Target: Transaldolase
Amino acid sequence: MSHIDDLAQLGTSTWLDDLSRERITSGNLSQVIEEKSVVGVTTNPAIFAAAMSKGDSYDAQIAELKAAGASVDQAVYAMSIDDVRNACDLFTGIFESSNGYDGRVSIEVDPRISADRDATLAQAKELWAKVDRPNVMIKIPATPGSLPAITDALAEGISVNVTLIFSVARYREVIAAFIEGIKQAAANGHDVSKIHSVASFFVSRVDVEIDKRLEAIGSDEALALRGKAGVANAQRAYAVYKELFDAAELPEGANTQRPLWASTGVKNPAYAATLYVSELAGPNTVNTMPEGTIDAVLEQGNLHGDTLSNSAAEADAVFSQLEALGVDLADVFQVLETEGVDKFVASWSELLESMEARLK
Model:
């Protein structure tokens, strides 16, 4: 039927990049699964923040939580868990039919503990046990401290959405941590066939940083390269996926860790709104799209087959050309990681402020 269905036939599952209570009550979340072929969802603090400030969708539970003695942290916890568990129920049919790959709902641990392995693990177990739904996924970022918490968590049978992956180097480390996670899960007696993971690899961020730097260079050639690095970087990640899982020896029954294209909303009005979907389509992948990007794909389409599998030559040429023009790609990826963690933590404080505003 739809262009999202065509995208799944190419191998790329479509997830939605937020779980606002607006979507649930309105019936939008059912509609999006049923009509837009959405087969997974993730939490979104920034959107959550906004919804409490500008909307009445949480008014009922805020009244509840203000009636009890709820702190800002407890309110935020309670509200997001109720959303997530509600989404888990509704995605149960897809979870069961998809061999556990899709039908997933992701929820993060506290962004402020992301350099703290122990605390990240502790809160991963806590969230896992509290939500108490087998299709939930705990978002754990691929940043210092929490990267090894990824294998610890998988070792306990927790399914993990790895987030804040910006570079192929760090993606390689994420895959290694997944393989060790599943090896330890087996050694700890867990049925490894029910442990899943996705690796959320950011796309638009790269072009935002690099488009600026290409404009600073200002040459014809630099300007002609704009809007290419994000796709190219992701395609290089896909080659790595194939490489490391080819080389890997996983316990029997183990799932693959599918690459997931995140931040796939275009940030420049001149770029086609389907750029980070059509160019990143192919086997064993997920794309976590903003709903506006889902609607762009649905009405505009512009898919042209699998654009991932045979993509490595093109993508490398983009990167070798960027480095010929003097763009310091290692510095770019370091800026993205630092800015990534700060944005991550910042949007969390934005949510805590929003929340505090309502609880007074």
